[PDB]
Amino acid sequence: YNKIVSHLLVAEPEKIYAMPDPTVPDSDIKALTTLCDLADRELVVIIGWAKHIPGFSTLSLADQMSLLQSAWMEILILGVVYRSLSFEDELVYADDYIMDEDQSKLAGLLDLNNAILQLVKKYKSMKLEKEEFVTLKAIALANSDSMHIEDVEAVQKLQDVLHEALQDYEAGQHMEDPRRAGKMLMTLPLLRQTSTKAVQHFYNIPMHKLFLEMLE
Amino acid sequence: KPYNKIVSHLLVAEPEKIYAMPDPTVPDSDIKALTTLCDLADRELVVIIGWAKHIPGFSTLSLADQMSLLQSAWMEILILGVVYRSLSFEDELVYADDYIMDEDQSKLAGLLDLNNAILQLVKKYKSMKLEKEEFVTLKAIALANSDSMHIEDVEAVQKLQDVLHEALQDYEAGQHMEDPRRAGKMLMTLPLLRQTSTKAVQHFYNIKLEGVPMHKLFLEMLEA
Ligand SMILES: CC/C(=C(\c1ccc(O)cc1)c1ccc(OCCN(C)C)cc1)c1ccccc1
Ligand SMILES: CC/C(=C(\c1ccc(O)cc1)c1ccc(OCCN(C)C)cc1)c1ccccc1
Ligand SMILES: C[C@H](CCC(=O)O)[C@H]1CC[C@H]2[C@@H]3[C@H](O)C[C@@H]4C[C@H](O)CC[C@]4(C)[C@H]3C[C@H](O)[C@]12C
Ligand SMILES: C[C@H](CCC(=O)O)[C@H]1CC[C@H]2[C@@H]3[C@H](O)C[C@@H]4C[C@H](O)CC[C@]4(C)[C@H]3C[C@H](O)[C@]12C
């Protein structure tokens, strides 16, 4: 077994919940607010998780932040994609918040959710395992291509270590396909692309009580 | 060991130089630079379409899928081209032998942010010492792995990806045994290529929005 990959499994964060309020009228506003709150709570956990990635803490705090700033959305997206592998045309943002097509339209996330579903499809066909998922996650962070990195060589070494862990895992656990590690790496471009779409949509995406009182 | 068939075909199919040929009668300006790049791009894209037909297995996909792949990866192929041509240079982008943009030229063209992002790609490939054989293979892989949402025959496209991926892996095993993970490191550069290309396409349309390209037939229609 690969020590780094096994270590990554154990450092995997605990499940987080959306906890949507059932007495609140279902709406785009509710959905988006639920997702935003869920994301922020997942991110606090992600920041702590990173510190357990072998080598991450040896980087400067400036570089640690740069990597996290460049890859935070890719980590969130990869999480949802993974939790959705055993579902059909649905996204498990959380055990207590699974979105189907109709819910996506109502939240104005049809396009974006379908892109995320594109990722789920590829991973389904490859039968992505938990070991591969957590290693790819760490790789996405290490390979986030921030332009503000101070020690390029230290980040490259970080990438090389996680990359070796993945090929080592793939070499022993999947001899039926000697190109499986490469196929995993080839899914990163779509992850980066979908992550970019999500971030772009987040910005693109009031106080009626007080407002009505100001007019009164 | 002798290069496998795929890499051999790609090296032979590699297009001859293409010049930007900016109009000498037109004074320098942001509009000129952008007009020049657009014209070069269009001629390169014509050459790229013919080049793809020479990629083993591409002409076997339906014409709809051939189109989808090309419509998804055209900018990545063009960007990988400029990046490769700029490897032996420093802080300058070689769009063509007759069109090299340094920083001050980029600022004048309004392309500083985009060109700086393209130079980021150059920097990575320079440290890896990207070779021509790896370059032609990556262009082909970028085309097959473009991730279009309009693919009809997913398995056919997946097979094309595997054949090209194998060509790279085999090339690296025989040519760079000293680094058992060199093929993987090449593949890991694709995300930045996708990111920079998306950034370029978006900047292009923001340009045509606040205006862009000096249309030839335009003034003729008005003078007529
Ligand atoms: C796809 C759902 C989503 C987010 C999400 C994705 C995966 C996941 O596990 C949890 C949430 C999402 C929404 C908001 C968000 O904010 C981060 C910034 N904070 C500091 C305000 C992040 C992700 C989203 C992204 C762009 C526009 C609208 C919604
Ligand atoms: C970076 C230079 C560039 C182009 C380019 C890149 C690589 C290369 O080898 C040659 C040019 C560029 C400009 C226009 C363009 O148009 C394609 C669409 N046609 C059909 C109008 C493509 C690339 C560009 C891209 C977006 C905005 C401004 C300029
Ligand atoms: C949610 C949390 C604060 C929790 C709290 O109220 O105590 C804050 C503190 C640090 C924040 C993060 C940092 O500002 C770094 C990143 C900045 C990006 O623009 C968004 C994600 C990003 C990763 C942030 C997510 C988030 O809003 C964080 C994680
Ligand atoms: C330049 C050439 C025609 C030039 C001419 O002889 O007049 C045209 C004809 C078909 C065009 C292509 C097709 O419309 C398909 C693609 C559409 C994308 O938006 C740009 C690239 C794209 C790949 C196009 C590049 C280009 O503008 C093409 C290749």
Side-chain angles (χ1 to χ4, degrees), chain A residues 1-13 15-87 89-104 107-152 154-172 174-204 206-207 210-212 214-215, chain B residues 2-4 6-89 91-154 156-158 160-209 211 213 215-216 218-219 221-224:
Chain A
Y1 79 89
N2 184 275
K3 300 169 182 63
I4 288 176
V5 179
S6 297
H7 185 73
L8 287 175
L9 286 173
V10 174
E12 187 60 359
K15 291 189 171 187
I16 290 167
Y17 304 86
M19 299 183 84
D21 187 333
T23 69
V24 175
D26 285 66
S27 65
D28 54 304
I29 306 297
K30 183 194 176 182
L32 302 175
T33 302
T34 294
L35 292 172
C36 285
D37 177 85
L38 175 66
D40 276 11
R41 278 182 288 122
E42 293 191 73
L43 290 167
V44 173
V45 167
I46 286 172
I47 294 179
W49 158 79
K51 307 202 303 180
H52 296 85
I53 297 172
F56 186 83
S57 291
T58 62
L59 297 173
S60 72
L61 285 175
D63 278 353
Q64 287 178 46
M65 290 174 92
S66 298
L67 295 199
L68 284 164
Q69 280 176 56
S70 283
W72 59 279
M73 185 62 95
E74 282 185 46
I75 298 171
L76 290 177
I77 298 285
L78 195 51
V80 190
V81 169
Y82 183 75
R83 298 185 294 269
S84 302
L85 305 180
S86 61
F87 289 75
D89 298 335
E90 291 186 300
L91 298 179
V92 176
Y93 282 97
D95 286 46
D96 60 341
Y97 202 69
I98 307 170
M99 289 183 65
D100 49 32
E101 187 184 67
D102 293 309
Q103 295 180 59
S104 297
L109 294 171
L110 190 69
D111 288 354
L112 180 56
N113 271 11
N114 280 305
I116 296 173
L117 280 172
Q118 206 184 330
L119 282 165
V120 174
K121 185 187 177 184
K122 187 117 201 174
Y123 288 134
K124 256 187 185 179
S125 69
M126 293 174 80
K127 298 179 178 176
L128 181 62
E129 316 171 328
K130 182 84 162 182
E131 284 80 355
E132 301 168 317
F133 163 62
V134 299
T135 300
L136 269 177
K137 232 203 304 161
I139 286 184
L141 177 59
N143 194 55
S144 47
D145 297 300
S146 170
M147 49 168 136
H148 310 90
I149 295 169
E150 310 181 316
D151 196 344
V152 177
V155 173
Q156 181 71 59
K157 169 115 182 65
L158 178 55
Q159 283 165 24
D160 291 1
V161 164
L162 298 176
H163 180 188
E164 184 191 330
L166 170 75
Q167 78 163 173
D168 186 59
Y169 174 77
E170 293 305 328
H174 287 277
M175 280 177 257
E176 7 69 52
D177 186 21
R179 300 313 177 230
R180 189 177 172 82
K183 294 179 183 173
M184 287 302 160
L185 295 170
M186 279 169 74
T187 62
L188 296 176
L190 181 58
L191 174 59
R192 170 80 50 91
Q193 181 193 314
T194 306
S195 154
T196 290
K197 285 183 179 181
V199 181
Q200 270 172 12
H201 186 295
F202 177 52
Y203 300 84
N204 294 188
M207 293 181 87
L210 195 58
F211 192 15
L212 222 71
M214 302 180 87
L215 291 175
Chain B
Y3 299 158
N4 63 64
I6 304 292
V7 180
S8 296
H9 277 205
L10 298 175
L11 283 173
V12 175
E14 179 65 5
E16 295 303 328
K17 279 178 177 177
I18 294 172
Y19 294 90
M21 300 177 269
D23 200 322
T25 67
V26 177
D28 298 329
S29 68
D30 62 323
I31 294 299
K32 181 185 181 181
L34 302 177
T35 293
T36 302
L37 290 164
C38 287
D39 178 34
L40 170 68
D42 280 352
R43 280 180 287 114
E44 288 189 81
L45 290 172
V46 168
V47 169
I48 284 166
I49 286 167
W51 164 81
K53 298 161 62 180
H54 286 131
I55 296 174
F58 181 80
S59 60
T60 64
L61 302 169
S62 63
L63 284 170
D65 283 347
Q66 286 177 50
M67 286 177 71
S68 292
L69 265 48
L70 282 165
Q71 293 170 329
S72 272
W74 62 274
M75 185 63 94
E76 286 186 42
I77 296 178
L78 287 173
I79 289 179
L80 199 49
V82 59
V83 166
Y84 180 71
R85 295 187 297 268
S86 314
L87 297 184
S88 68
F89 289 76
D91 306 312
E92 304 187 304
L93 291 176
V94 181
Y95 286 100
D97 280 353
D98 63 343
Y99 211 70
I100 300 182
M101 292 185 79
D102 62 7
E103 186 172 77
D104 294 326
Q105 293 178 66
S106 297
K107 298 186 182 155
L108 294 176
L111 298 182
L112 187 65
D113 287 342
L114 185 58
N115 277 0
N116 274 347
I118 295 178
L119 284 169
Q120 209 196 324
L121 273 166
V122 172
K123 173 180 179 182
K124 180 144 50 161
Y125 285 128
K126 276 159 85 164
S127 65
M128 291 171 82
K129 288 174 177 168
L130 180 63
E131 306 170 330
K132 199 177 201 72
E133 292 83 348
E134 301 171 311
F135 165 62
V136 302
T137 309
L138 281 176
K139 282 192 302 187
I141 287 171
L143 173 63
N145 197 47
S146 60
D147 292 315
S148 177
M149 296 168 350
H150 306 111
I151 299 298
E152 289 177 344
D153 204 331
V154 182
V157 169
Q158 178 64 59
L160 175 58
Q161 286 176 26
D162 294 335
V163 166
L164 295 173
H165 176 191
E166 184 59 59
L168 176 70
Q169 296 277 178
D170 179 72
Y171 174 78
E172 300 295 352
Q175 223 49 37
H176 292 282
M177 196 182 258
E178 77 286 346
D179 180 351
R181 292 177 285 289
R182 189 173 172 87
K185 298 177 185 167
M186 289 294 162
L187 296 176
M188 280 166 71
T189 68
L190 296 176
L192 183 49
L193 175 59
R194 175 79 53 92
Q195 186 190 319
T196 311
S197 294
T198 292
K199 192 127 56 186
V201 175
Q202 302 186 321
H203 181 61
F204 176 68
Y205 288 121
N206 277 174
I207 286 180
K208 297 191 75 72
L209 210 67
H215 213 123
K216 1 226 182 183
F218 196 17
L219 195 43
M221 293 175 78
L222 286 162
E223 289 178 297

